[PDB]
Structures are given as C-alpha cells and as structure tokens.
Structure 1
Amino acid sequence: VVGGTEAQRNSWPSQISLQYRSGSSWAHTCGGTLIRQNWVMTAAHCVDRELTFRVVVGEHNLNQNDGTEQYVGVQKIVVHPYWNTDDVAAGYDIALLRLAQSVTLNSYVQLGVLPRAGTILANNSPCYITGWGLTRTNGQLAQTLQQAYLPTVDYAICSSSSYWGSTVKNSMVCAGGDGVRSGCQGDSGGPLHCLVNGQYAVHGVTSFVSRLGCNVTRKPTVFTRVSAYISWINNVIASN
C-alpha cells in the first residue's frame, strides 16, 4: 500500500496474509479475506504458481511475533473457472481457499462481511484498501498492516479513455487514482473495505495496478467486484 498509515491492530480482522514456502521460511505474497472459519477469498492470480501456501490470520507485523497469529495450511484451491492468467483485464480474478483447519475467531480474527449480490457503489464512495504490499512503486513490503483511504471511481469514469479504458470491466471496482495512495505488489488478493449503511463490507479483491507504477494519477487501483460473485462463492463453498 503506497501512501498508507499503519492500521490499528483490531481494525481489519478478516484480513489475512497468504504466504508460500521458500526453503526453511515462508514469504508473504498476497492478502486475502477470511469469509468462513475455513475459507479464504483471494485473487486467482495469487495462486497461479504451483506453490505451497499457508494463510496467517490474526497477523499484524509480518516480521515479529504479535502473540495473536494462527497459521493454517491451504487444503484446496478453487480458482474462478473463467480466469485466464495472461488476461487479468478480462476479470474473474478471484479464488477461494479451503483451509486445512477451521481457525478460532476472537477480536483479531473475524469473518469479512460481503456485499449483497449486484450492489454497485456510487462514485466516490468511502473505502480503505489494506495490506502488507510495497510501500512505494518498486519498493519493499510493509512490516505492519497498512491502510489507505481510496474513494471508488465509478465504472463510467473508470472505463473512460483518460483512466483505464476498455481494460476495466463492470465486474470490477476501481478506487483511488489520486497519484499518491494505491495498492502495490503484495496487496493483491486482499480486501477493499467500503462503508455502507454504517457497516464496512469487503466490496473488492485487490487485482491490479498500472504497469507504469502503483500510485499513478488516473490509474486507480482495480479490484474484482465481490458483489458480482456472490452466487459463485456460495456455490463453491456449498459443494466443498
């Protein structure tokens, strides 16, 4: 997250760190949203590599023990069947992970609430992106969970030529593009939390940024629109 501020420890309890094993260690690679005690919602592109993944819930500082983390293997990966790795612009960048065990819920570990099916945010709706991703374009991961206020940029505005053009679909949500604050590598797969009727809901799964860089004016961060996948999600979880 470029231009963020450190999150308070109990602000975003459904945020997870998706990590892959590298030798003796584990490396953070993406965010995710805990949606059931044994299910995590992340971006399909986070799990294209044939890696060994684990999810850490209750995580705050990647580099220190917080006394609040729980670590769980990933037991099954269900990517959206229409997902095409060389075509993130086509969308369907979403995946569900069934965890090998059900995690315990407490103040640091809660399920993320999802929007009702088809809900579209009005332009400039208030949202926060969260994650441990790069803090500067071509920078480094954050140690502590970062958050950044990113107002949505509606589809009409987002798909217009000065912004993302045909690259953005109505299956996506755009937010930010102020040239200061944005998602950045390592944030993919995590939540875009937006305030609606007084409650935060995870409206977006962080998908991509401009090849030009993370915080680029008129290239707002792009997310998979969770509200277009509600049946899919329930369908997957119901059959597994």
Structure 2
Amino acid sequence: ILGGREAEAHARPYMASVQLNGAHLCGGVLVAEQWVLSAAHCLEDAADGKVQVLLGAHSLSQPEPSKRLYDVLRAVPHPDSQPDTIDHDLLLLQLSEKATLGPAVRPLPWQRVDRDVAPGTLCDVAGWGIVNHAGRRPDSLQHVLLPVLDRATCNRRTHHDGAITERLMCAESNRRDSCKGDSGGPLVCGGVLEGVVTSGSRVCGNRKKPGIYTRVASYAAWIDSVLA
C-alpha cells in the first residue's frame, strides 16, 4: 500500500495472506468459513512449494493468538481467466478445514447486487503489499482510503484506454494507491466487499494510471456456484 497508514490490529478479520513457502504473495478475503477469495495470477510464477492461507494476522512474522495457517485443499480459478488479461481475475481457495472464527477471524459479506459503486465513494483497500517504490515489504497490515473513480475517466487513452470493462472498477492513484503484493486483496465500501485488487502487473502511485479492482457483484453467480 503506497501512501497509507498501518491498519488497526485485527480490525479487519476478513483479511487473509496468500503465501508460498512462508513468503506473502497476495492478499485475500475470507468470504465463507472455508473459502478465501483472491486474484487468478497469484500462484503463477510459483515454483515447487507450500501454498498456504494465513488468517488472524496483523504481523506476518510476530506470533499472535488469532494467527492460524491453513492448507489450500482446492484452488478454483475463474474459467474465463487467462495469464495475458486482467479480466475475470478471481480465484477461490478452499481451506483444508473450516476457519476457527473469532473476533480476529470473521468472513466479510460480499456485494451480490450488480450495481456500480458511485464514483467518489471512499473505499478501504488493505494489504501487506510493498509500501514504497523501493519495494519495502511491510510486516504489519497497511491500508488506504481511496475514492472510486468513474469508468469514463478511467478508460481515457491517457489512462487505461478502454481496458476497464463493466465487470471492473477504479480508484484514484495519486501517490496513495494499492501496489505489488496488494493484489487479491479486498476493496471494501460501506463494510461490504465491492472489489478485489487485480494481480496484473501495473504501475503504482501515478494518477494517470488508476488502480484496477475486479467487481465481486459482477461474478456473484460464479462465487455462489463454487461455494455451494
């Protein structure tokens, strides 16, 4: 998270860390007791290794009572996802067993009604992604409040040149943004999951290239289908 604050310890119980060989790769959001929603390209450059979801954390390294590592029993990518495109950049991970729910582990209600988030709405994106352009990996959870940018502005040739589909949404990127490793993370507006940070390689902190987030309500039927 570029230009953000450190998150309040365990204030976002839905928050998950998709890790490979004890190193954080992507953010994730607990959508059900045994399901974590993330991005489709998080396990791409992955070598022979242990893929695990960390729940109940604030610090990745320090011990916490709430912290629990889970094995990925099933990794369901969106059928229409491709490595080449940021479209349908969703991946549902089923945990080895149901998550032990508590004040620090609670699934987030995700938007089921397909309505665009009103441009200007202040949304909260959190993650353990790089905090500076030098690539400093934060140990503790970080977050930033970004206003939703309208698709028309986002699709300008100077911006994303029509790449933002009706299934995607945007947020402002002037210094304050989401970045590398924030991918797969949640975009929460009014305590409800609206977007998922894309795992597509982009350029953070520049206002002319806004943040791209996959609208969950746009893929509500697929999520429902998988979780059942």
Quick check: TM above 0.5? yes
* 1:116 positional shift: 2.4
Residue 216 of structure 2, aligned match among 219, 226, 236: 226
Structure 1 distance, partners of 2:39, 2:29, is: 10
- Of stretches 95-104 and 40-49 in structure 1, the one that deviates more from structure 2 is 40-49
- Identical positions, percent: 34
Residue 55 of structure 1 is matched in structure 2 by: 53
The SS at the match of 2:62 is: coil
Structure having the larger proportion of residues in helix: 1
Structure 1 residues 146-183: Cα deviation after superposition (integer angstroms, max 9, x where no partner): 010111112122112232112222211111222x1111
**Residue 207 in 1 paired to residue 198 in 2?**
yes
Q: In angstroms, what is the RMSD of aligned CA positions?
A: 1.4
Normalization by structure 2: what TM-score? 0.94
* 1:138 positional shift: 3.8
- Of stretches 74-83 and 137-146 in structure 1, the one that deviates more from structure 2 is 137-146
Residue 8 of structure 2 is matched in structure 1 by: 8
Residue 151 of structure 1, aligned match among 147, 158, 183: 147
Unaligned segments of structure 2, at least 5 residues: none
Any conservation in 1 of the 2:54–2:69 contact (CA below 8 Å)? yes
* 1:2 positional shift: 0.5
Structure 2 distance, partners of 1:173, 1:138, is: 27
Residue 112 of structure 1 is matched in structure 2 by: 108
Unaligned segments of structure 1, at least 5 residues: none
**Residue 33 in 1 paired to residue 23 in 2?**
no
**Residue 140 in 1 paired to residue 136 in 2?**
yes
Structure 1 distance, partners of 2:61, 2:172, is: 28
The SS at the match of 1:165 is: coil
**Residue 181 in 1 paired to residue 172 in 2?**
no
Structure 1 residues 31-89: Cα deviation after superposition (integer angstroms, max 9, x where no partner): 0000111001000011233643100111100121122201110000000000010222x
Residue 103 of structure 1 is matched in structure 2 by: 99
Residue 121 of structure 1, aligned match among 117, 120, 125: 117
Letter in 1 for 2:119: N
